[PDB]
Amino acid sequence: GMENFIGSHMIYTYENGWEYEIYIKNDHTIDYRIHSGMVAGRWVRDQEVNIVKLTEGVYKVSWTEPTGTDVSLNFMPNEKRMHGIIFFPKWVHEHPEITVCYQNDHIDLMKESREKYETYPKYVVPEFAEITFLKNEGVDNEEVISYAPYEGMTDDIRAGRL
Amino acid sequence: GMENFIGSHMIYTYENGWEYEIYIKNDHTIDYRIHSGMVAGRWVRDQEVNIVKLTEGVYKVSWTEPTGTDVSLNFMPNEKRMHGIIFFPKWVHEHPEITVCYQNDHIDLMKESREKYETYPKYVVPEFAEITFLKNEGVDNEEVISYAPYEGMTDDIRAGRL
């Protein structure tokens, strides 16, 4: 149920092996942390989101970012699968490393960049991923995502050694 | 199933009574037509979309628009409900009537406007709606959404008189 979904700390893994981590911190907030790929190293705390239950076993988590990126994710916890679509401004695709930071401390840079560089055409990425780690960390657990990704961290998260 | 979803011609109705119409014309294309509200009169043909089946009974239809608007919809046909999130550039919220047209014949205006006016902060609208009309019109039926909305048209669609 929704009570079970809120608090979920997940890693999901794309076909190419990229690992993305999310924590459903409360009914309107996520933290997230990206371990691989185009924006590996990016992490975000206290992102306001819309979270709804679409039907039994299906949740939707959606938000807009200070960079302009729009995201709509669906999670299907019982099937250990998610789907996401990300609508990136062109500039995020062309200058991804600008976005690779603890975004919360670089909002002004995100805003400068979204005005400086081109938005269109957008780079739109819809893709499924497998949910390859799940633990409920409770609500408003501020320790779950509290520093940048480091080498081997996803192994450490799955091992429960942190 | 997906074969049943593709071809769906729907009207869905928000709590405020606004009626939005969509036609899932093929596995990567929609047409749509808005009868009420902020952008009443807007209609679009041949919009490329991502359509996936998330699980039994749950579909996702998502796309970006020439105006910059990003949309991610979920349909739950058996429960006669949908959820959508729309991420509007600020300018679409402030100048909605620019977008009220047959968009296909005004792409240059959409592109001029998305560059002329402000994008941020976005106006983001997540909302459920009830699916209040459904008929499968087949695949690539070019007559389903082929002119602008007019007074009473949704009654005419539900009556099957067109």
Q: Which domains does chain B have, with CATH numbers?
A: 1-162 (2.40.128.20)
A-chain CB neighbours of B74 within 8 Å are 54, 60, 74
Report the b/e string of A117-142 with b at 16+ CB within 10 A. Answer: eebeebbbebeebebeeeeeeeeebe
Q: Please tell me whether residue B78 adopts helix, strand or coil conformation.
A: helix
CB atoms B62 and A72 under 8 Å: yes
A-chain CB neighbours of B124 within 8 Å are 50, 63-64, 70
Of A52, A63, A126, the CB nearest to B83: A52
Radius of gyration over every alpha carbon of chain A, rounded to an integer in angstroms? 15
Experimental method: X-ray
| Distance from C-alpha of B21 to C-alpha of B11, rounded to nearest angstrom | 4
Residue whose C-alpha is closest to residue A132's, from A65, A80, A86, A56: A80
**Pair of tokens at residue A146:** 């509290």
CB atoms B85 and A72 under 8 Å: yes
Would you please indicate which residues of B are annotated as catalytic (active-site) residues?
20, 65
CB atoms A52 and B87 under 8 Å: no
H-type alpha helices, B1-146:
2-5, 90-94, 107-116
Would you please indicate which residues of A are annotated as catalytic (active-site) residues?
20, 65
Final resolution, Å: 1.4
Residue whose C-alpha is closest to residue B124's, from A127, A139, A66: A66
Contact B68, B94 (CB under 8 A): no
| Distance from C-alpha of B60 to C-alpha of B56, rounded to nearest angstrom | 12
